[PDB]
Design a protein around this nucleic acid. Structure first.
Lengths: 98, 102, 78, 93, 82, 87, 92, 87
DNA sequence: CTGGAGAATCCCGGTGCCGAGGCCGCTCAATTGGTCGTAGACAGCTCTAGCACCGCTTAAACGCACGTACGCGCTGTCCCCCGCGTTTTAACCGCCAAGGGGATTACTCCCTAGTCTCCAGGCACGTGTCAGA
DNA sequence: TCTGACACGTGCCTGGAGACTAGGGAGTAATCCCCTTGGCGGTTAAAACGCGGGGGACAGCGCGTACGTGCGTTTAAGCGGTGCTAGAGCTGTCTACGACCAATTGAGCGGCCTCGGCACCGGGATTCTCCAG
């Protein structure tokens, strides 16, 4: 009667729902205020775009897609299903930037 | 105009306007705007084909971010030309490995 | 206040990005990764701002920055 | 007013799928895509324009640059659709 | 005029020099020809765009500068050839 | 001294000119009818090849080192070519 | 020699008048300075392009260098570079 | 104007390569002056590396062995030059 | 071991929230032929090397017999980051307004590339020892 | 241990450098405006803490295995030795080609809209799956 799950059914909802549906999920305005607060260290009274911060969420999630996929390949070629410091850092390295 | 006279659906005049005002150099390419317009119209036609049909498989007629990225990435060589690009409104791909199964 | 970055919601768009498992060590170092990459785009964004005479940055400026950083995004013009 | 590089994209869409809608985000995807592909191809034509050591960029450099960038089936419809399209225009001025 | 089986010209002791220079131990003989396959695809890419380059330059005896442009096309420009 | 100086000190080209020069000629015939008995250009081909082996064997080597191994399986070079985008 | 030869070994003769070297490493520096050169100049070109400006000067060069390689090396670059420009504005 | 900028490297040669690189028509008021002074700086850095590295073996010459010593011990430009092999 | 309640997940279906669609004169970009403005191959060929030219033993690769010397799997081992769940706290969603510098239009001060004259360090060719092989 | 190509100088430039010579773009004043400053109200985005459950990679131990080493070889190449010209850049120019405009003409621009597009309900239908047998 409690509708609790199987350990992976949340990740099944991740792959099915979250890999099927592809929409941005975090609210734009507080992160826009974060771009304001981090931007305080540069110059006074800057104006931004809603579309620039939505571009920040888009580049953030696609950035997570690329980091996640090569992080996976670094795990799985080394016979691992979980992600570590060495595979995220090495994953960033093996593009040829580092 | 010459765009129709080129047997083109795309504006050869406006494409040539991109050439002269693009400033990437006495002339620009002779057949080249017709050439690029033909290729881009072709790959455009197949990507519209993929998003229209694949999106139409869910009764919807426009392109969702899932169908945006999938529509782009379902051509392997276009994926090769766009391997280091970011797709705004794309989300993810159907590349679910068996090791990506929980 | 970097605590505006809300970590379970960062996990939510990670799940939306397809992320299957996250170790506990991943969070702070990932804050480092977005920290350096994000300081790169706000950094070169500020260089474009200083070279020009505007106080209103654009998403097309982020397109310019990602063009320099090899993660160019469409869907905003340019 | 409004501006994009996708009004002809949904024109050719109606040439292929006459009853089909288009999302605005896809219109800007197509606009940014046309400009990106344009600057890449013109970039390679400029690079070969150095390489061949000409002060002239003609269609030869663009076509061979396209031959540099896309391998096989894009090449099929590139020389096919591209070159045949050039054949369709260039019999006159 | 007819040439066959020169892939062993990328010799095994050279693979000992660079591969054993890498510090990898038990570098298997069952993998050397596959490495020559990686050599095959890479080298046919740089020779590919190279021969398109000198084909545009319409020359029959190719200069090394063409090879420099070929590696340059893949971003793998190296120093010491022009 | 064996590995570092014998296997690592050599930086000059390692192959006798005529055979692999004919490898350049042979494979070059096999795509476009031709790289020739080139004196310095064929040397640029060998240098390019071995330098590219330095790169793929070095990131391949790092993938080996972190993965608790000192031998090779082809998946490593496949992944290196993947992340570079050779594959 | 069709290279950066004369200035590299010119200042090398300023540091060591009895110098024996090879053209090959000079070609290495020729590809190096030419390569980084076209990188920076291309960055200034697209730099003026992106911000809808039709001028390329030491601001485009300056910020372009800041994009490609910032840091204290950039601080000395604007130091001797900028003060050098000041000198050329004063002495010719 | 290069020596009349009091500097070590030519402003007209580097400026001519800027012009024939064909970027825009408006060349800067002091753009090759500043740019040639920056490459005077960093080129002077790698040539001080060339004097010390040449003098590693009572020599007046760096070679690609010494260039692998300097570059494989380098951080700034070795970080900045990734896919580059000194033959 | 299989196999449905049940919560997550579609499928039309209507209806306009309002955006995909709704639409024509004109204007700004633009088509066509000569003049003005102009860049690369043209066929033939010169001397470095292109293609055709050649003999032997030792050069570096190929191969035989020790010999060594490395990953990889089953099972345990105890490991540990995750998620339900209401509630957690301001943030969220929707509402807005009104002039200010943003965005845009107009003023203003600026506006250096091209050809030729000036000129001098620099390139290929030639000596020669200490740098060079 | 043995010795010769850049230091240095000389033909022979040939590109830096600068002055006319017409020449045009960013800073800034000025007008509407997206939103900054300030105000508003109801609803909610998401997640600490506590309970609940399985879960991650990796070694102990054992199997094991293979190219390198040593030693020897071995013909193509090394190294020495050919010949007329293949071809790269050059030869002068023809041979040939291209922008702006006189003149302007055509679909997006300008100008406004629209009515149903697909978002949101409406009701119903899937669905697969993890806890039941």
């Amino acid at each position: 009667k409690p509708h609790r799950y199987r350990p992976g059914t949340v990740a099944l909802r991740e792959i099915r729902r979250y890999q099927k549906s592809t929409e941005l999920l975090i609210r734009k305005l507080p992160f826009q205020r974060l771009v304001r607060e981090i931007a305080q260290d540069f110059k006074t009274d800057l104006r931004f775009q809603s579309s620039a911060v939505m571009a920040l969420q888009e580049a953030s999630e696609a950035y997570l897609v690329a980091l996640f996929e090569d992080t996976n390949l670094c795990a799985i070629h080394a016979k691992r299903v979980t992600i570590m410091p060495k595979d995220i850092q090495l994953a960033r390295r093996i593009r040829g930037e580092r | 105009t010459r765009s129709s006279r080129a047997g083109l659906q795309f504006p050869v005049g406006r494409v040539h306007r991109l050439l002269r005002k693009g400033n990437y150099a006495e002339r620009v390419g002779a057949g080249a705007p017709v050439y690029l317009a033909a290729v881009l119209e072709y790959l455009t036609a197949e990507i519209l084909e993929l998003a229209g049909n694949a999106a139409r498989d869910n009764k919807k007629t426009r392109i969702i971010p899932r169908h945006l990225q999938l529509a782009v990435r379902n051509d392997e060589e276009l994926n090769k030309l766009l391997g280091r690009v970011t797709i705004a409104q794309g989300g993810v791909l159907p590349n679910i490995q068996s090791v990506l199964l929980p | 206040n970097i605590q505006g970055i809300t970590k379970p919601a960062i996990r939510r768009l990670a799940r939306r990005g397809g992320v299957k498992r996250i170790s506990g060590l991943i969070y702070e170092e990932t804050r480092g990764v977005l920290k350096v990459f994000l300081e790169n785009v706000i950094r070169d964004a500020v260089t474009y701002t200083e070279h020009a005479k505007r106080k209103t940055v654009t998403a097309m400026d982020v397109v310019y920055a990602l063009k320099r950083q090899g993660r160019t995004l469409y869907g905003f013009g340019g | 007013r409004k501006e994009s590089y996708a009004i002809y994209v949904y024109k050719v869409l109606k040439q292929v799928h006459p009853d089909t809608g288009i999302s605005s985000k896809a219109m800007s995807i197509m606009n940014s895509f046309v400009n990106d592909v344009f600057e890449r191809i013109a970039g390679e034509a400029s690079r070969l324009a150095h390489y061949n050591k000409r002060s002239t960029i003609t269609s030869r450099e663009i076509q061979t640059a396209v031959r540099l960038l896309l391998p096989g089936e894009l090449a099929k419809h590139a020389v096919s659709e591209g070159t045949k399209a050039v054949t369709k225009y260039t019999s006159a001025k």
